[PDB]
Design a protein around this ligand. Structure first.
Ligand code: HEM
Ligand SMILES: [C-]#N
Length: 108
């Protein structure tokens, strides 16, 4: 992978206050508002059956590397033109580094 990590901790706190709202990180996990984000790093997009998927996510088949996720998070509804992800696109830029680190580490 190109991206090299910031901090495993702190990113947790960000996830907990941003993403945990809609998602989970745990193995399998409840696909609450969003799907679960375990093992996503290096698994293509749309890798969790049963939950309410979209054609758009499938057709927009994304590997979920750090770059693509970093971008997506900025503008999910743009990057995938057909998502229920009514998320406030991660503008902060900095915290993202930690958050992605945590996610990467969690999704090892
Ligand atoms: C910055 C914290 C967040 C992160 C790291 C994140 C990450 C992701 C990722 C990687 C996907 C792609 C799933 C896949 O293709 O398998 C996704 C989808 C989704 N997210 Fe988030 N998300 C965040 C916050 C949110 C929030 C707060 C909401 C709830 C308002 C939300 C709702 C959704 C939904 C509904 C999807 C499914 C969209 C689709 O596949 O069409 N997310 N998210
Ligand atoms: C999730 N955007």
């Amino acid at each position: 992978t190109e991206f090299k990590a910031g901090s495993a901790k702190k990113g947790a706190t960000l996830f907990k206050t941003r993403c945990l709202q809609c998602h989970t990180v745990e193995k399998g996990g409840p696909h609450k508002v969003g799907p679960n984000l375990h093992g996503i790093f290096g698994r293509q997009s749309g890798q969790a059956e049963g939950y309410s998927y979209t054609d758009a996510n499938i057709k927009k088949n994304v590997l979920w590397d750090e770059n693509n996720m970093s971008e997506y998070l900025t503008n999910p509804k743009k990057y995938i033109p057909g998502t229920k992800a009514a998320f406030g696109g991660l503008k902060k830029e900095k915290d993202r580094n930690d958050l992605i680190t945590y996610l990467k580490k969690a999704s090892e």
